[PDB]
Ligand binder design. Sequence first.
Ligand SMILES: COc1cc(Cc2cnc(N)nc2N)cc(OC)c1OC
Ligand SMILES: COc1cc(Cc2cnc(N)nc2N)cc(OC)c1OC
Length: 186
Amino acid sequence: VGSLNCIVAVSQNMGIGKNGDLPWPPLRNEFRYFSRMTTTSSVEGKQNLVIMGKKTWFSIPEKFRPLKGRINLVLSRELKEPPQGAHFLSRSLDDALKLTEQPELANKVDMVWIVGGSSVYKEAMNHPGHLKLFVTRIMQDFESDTFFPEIDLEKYKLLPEYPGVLSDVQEEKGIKYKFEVYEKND
Ligand SMILES: COc1cc(Cc2cnc(N)nc2N)cc(OC)c1OC
Ligand SMILES: COc1cc(Cc2cnc(N)nc2N)cc(OC)c1OC
């Protein structure tokens, strides 16, 4: 298995969701960026794995579930099988990464992308190891009911640039946003 990563878009007041929808108007190029980063695998003959909680999975419109060209794993203790269209189910983040080491996935998975929601972000972010955060800063306040966990800048270093990540300010639908990459290793 390659690198472990979170990827998120977040408003200025830290909001990542409002009733399981985007707090902001849909940004098509911001979504393109999400699909590119998560789908692109270095290693030939492998796909990236995406890991998400159950609410995050059910927040995706049906036409976009599973995320195509990526292996989809949902986290849940209540579910007893992967939801319709998903590939894998695990009880917890720890268990999902342990699986990634079994024979049915060890040779299949390149990068792992945690795509939410806020409790799965929080445990990944607080767990020791090499982890990057791909964070889009939406530079406006948007009403939200779910939030990104605090980024501890003592541990996470913001990278001065990163291949395939535009560094300058973007704007769609009248909303300015920018891409950032953070990296810890502890
Ligand atoms: C969990 O699945 C998806 C989530 C999102 C939200 C999202 C959007 N942008 C960024 N940078 N990160 C995110 N996590 C965007 C998506 O496609 C644009 C997803 O695939 C269906
Ligand atoms: C591309 O993936 C998403 C797209 C949208 C906006 C959207 C875009 N197209 C359609 N048909 N329905 C929608 N709700 C909304 C989302 O979250 C509610 C998505 O999940 C990350």
